[PDB]
């Protein structure tokens, strides 16, 4: 049983199919998991995401740079960044953002649409919880969505360090074909469903160890259809079991090497180190961010 894992990752064989997109109909659609006393869904969800990310070959440099989009809640706090900050090595630079105002444990927070966010540096890990409930129009064709997904795709291509990783929230209706295609630019990728929210079509699209070029060609419409087919035919038993064992929670500080190489220096040898979670390619200057403000 997978009830003791933090969640379920999409099996590779489902990734290789060519299904057509149909409506997502989850067996366990009605149910909820029993959370430990006083624990919020979004703390439990981010805890399980981080527990699963502990099993991947994440690059963990000194001066890890992490940015978290969609980090506010409708009560004005940031439960996800509180978990990320618990997970990440002490001293990790953590930047926060959301459309609406909130108070945060991140080292810096920007308020506004994500498209107004600019950074000088590159990043080692990008986390996104952004989601628009207005996409859940069951009465119409589920097409690839734009909006913040357009920003995220460009932000990965321009500001993710080689070797870095990504976890971007999707749902049945909140998804983007280019983001799936971008998954083929990592050494490995999956769609991960937390056990605590398994009654939802939510998944985190995870790109592990960015390579900056297409390692494989992924049609994003087909892959989202494959993702739904997997969810439709593989009910996941809701479970909070993994939340009760936090003894191994913190991200291992691997001291991954950072180097500044340009493009012509990235061999198959470098690509191989990137692929194994053993190298980060970016500058290690000061981290500078800003938010664009429109005046009247």
């Amino acid at each position: 049983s997978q009830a003791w894992q933090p969640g379920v990752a999409m099996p590779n064989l489902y990734k290789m199919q060519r299904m057509l997109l149909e409506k997502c109909d989850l067996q366990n659609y009605g149910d909820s998991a029993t959370l430990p006393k006083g624990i919020m869904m979004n703390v439990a969800k981010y805890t399980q995401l981080c527990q699963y990310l502990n099993t991947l070959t994440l690059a963990v440099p000194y001066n890890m740079r992490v940015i978290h989009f969609g980090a506010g809640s409708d009560k004005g706090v940031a439960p996800g960044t509180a978990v990320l900050r618990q997970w990440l090595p002490t001293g990790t630079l953590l930047v926060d953002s959301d459309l609406n105002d909130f108070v945060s444990d991140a080292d810096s927070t920007l308020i506004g649409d994500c498209a107004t966010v600019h950074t000088a540096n590159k990043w080692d890990l990008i986390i996104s919880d952004m989601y628009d409930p207005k996409t859940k129009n069951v009465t119409k064709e589920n097409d690839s969505k734009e909006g913040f997904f357009t920003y995220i795709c460009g932000f990965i291509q321009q500001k993710l360090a080689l070797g870095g990783s990504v976890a971007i929230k999707i749902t049945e209706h909140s998804w983007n074909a280019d983001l799936y295609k971008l998954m083929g630019h990592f050494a490995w990728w999956t769609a991960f469903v937390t056990n605590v929210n398994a009654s939802s079509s939510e998944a985190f699209l995870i790109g592990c160890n960015y390579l900056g070029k297409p390692r494989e060609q992924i049609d994003g419409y087909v892959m989202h259809a494959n993702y739904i087919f997997w969810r439709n035919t593989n009910p996941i038993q809701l479970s909070s079991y993994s939340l009760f064992d936090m003894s191994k929670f913190p991200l291992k500080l691997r001291g991954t090497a950072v180097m500044s190489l340009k493009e012509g220096q990235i061999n198959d040898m470098i690509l191989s180190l990137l692929s194994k979670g053993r190298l980060i390619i970016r500058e290690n200057n000061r981290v500078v961010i800003s938010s664009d403000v429109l005046v009247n």
């Binding site: 809640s73 002490t90 444990d105």
Partner: protein, 115 residues
């Protein structure tokens, strides 16, 4: 000479029977930690709960200035351990209580330096 006193207004609102500030961010943790008051990662012992610090700061939560010249927050970006019996109101707890500068424990909730 005027200055709003949110700490007093919250204490007085608590005394008059008002519901505490909610949605403080409680963390999952082992509950085998050092039990110290304000730490860089959750450190609750068996008798404590650990919360994300910013969510437990009255000034952070009310969007008002922090009462010191450099308007610095000693909770934001850290974790605060709250005795389980008081975890229904972490904001009030951090307001009313003091951290021993030698123990790192809460005075009267773990500090044993005065024995």
């Amino acid at each position: 000479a005027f200055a709003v006193d949110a700490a007093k207004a919250y204490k007085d609102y608590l005394a008059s029977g008002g519901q505490p500030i909610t949605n403080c961010v409680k963390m999952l943790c082992t509950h085998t930690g050092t039990g110290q008051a304000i730490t860089v990662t959750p450190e609750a012992n068996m008798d404590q709960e650990s919360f994300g610090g910013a969510s437990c700061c009255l000034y952070c939560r009310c969007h008002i200035d922090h009462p010191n010249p450099k308007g610095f927050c000693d909770l934001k970006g850290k974790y605060v351990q709250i005795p389980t019996t008081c975890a229904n109101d972490p904001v009030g707890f951090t307001l009313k209580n003091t951290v021993c500068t030698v123990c790192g424990m809460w005075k009267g909730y773990g500090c044993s330096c005065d024995q």
